[PDB]
Amino acid sequence: VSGLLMVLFKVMTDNRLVIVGETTTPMSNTLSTVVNNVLRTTYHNNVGVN
Amino acid sequence: VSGLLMVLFKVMTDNRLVIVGETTTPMSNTLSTVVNNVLRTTYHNNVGVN
Amino acid sequence: LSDDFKQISDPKGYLTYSVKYEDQFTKKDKLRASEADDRIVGPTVNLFK
Numbered sequence: 090v091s092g093l094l095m096v097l098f099k100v101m102t103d104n105r106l107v108i109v110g111e112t113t114t115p116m117s118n119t120l121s122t123v124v125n126n127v128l129r130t131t132y133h134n135n136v137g138v139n
Numbered sequence: 140v141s142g143l144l145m146v147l148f149k150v151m152t153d154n155r156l157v158i159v160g161e162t163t164t165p166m167s168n169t170l171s172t173v174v175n176n177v178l179r180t181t182y183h184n185n186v187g188v189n
Numbered sequence: 190l191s192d193d194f195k196q197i198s199d200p201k202g203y204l205t206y207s208v209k210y211e212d213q214f215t216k217k218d219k220l221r222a223s224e225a226d227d228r229i230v231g232p233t234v235n236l237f238k
Contacts, residue, residue: 100203104194111198115225121168124226135199138206138233166222181218 111135161185206236 111134117125161184167175 105200106194106196107200108196108198115228119168119223119225120229121166121222121226124168124229128229132229136228136232138236162218164218164220166220166226168223168226169221 109133159183208236208238210238 112131113134114131115128120128162181163184164181165178170178
């Protein structure tokens with residue numbers, strides 16, 4: 090009950106700004122027609138799990 | 140006439156069972172539209188002459 | 190300047206994923222794709238082995 094109160098403290102005193110970094114763009118010739126439509130134009134460099 | 144009789148002996152006393160081994164699957168993005176339709180879904184590992 | 194908040198390259202997030210593998214369930218088909226077919230959908234494949 091004290092730890093769940095403390096996890097609520099850290100999320101409240103947050104202060105972070107996201108900065109676009111590393112980003113790369115792939116070509117239409119080098120993607121499957123199923124993964125091509127998912128990408129808008131430019132995926133953020135690094136990779137995500139989903 | 141004796142060798143052609145002997146080649147008929149070996150084919151008669153045969154006993155072998157084919158086992159699926161090594162098989163790999165390619166992607167649609169990595170094949171020509173002419174070689175793509177030939178492959179059903181999964182080509183047997185190793186390669187064939189035809 | 191005051192500088193209240195500091196900036197970062199990549200965001201973290203509060204909710205993450207966990208897994209318990211079974212080291213006896215392996216498929217005998219080593220599949221393959223392109224390099225840009227790999228990058229975008231890459232680490233997500235190795236979290237759901």
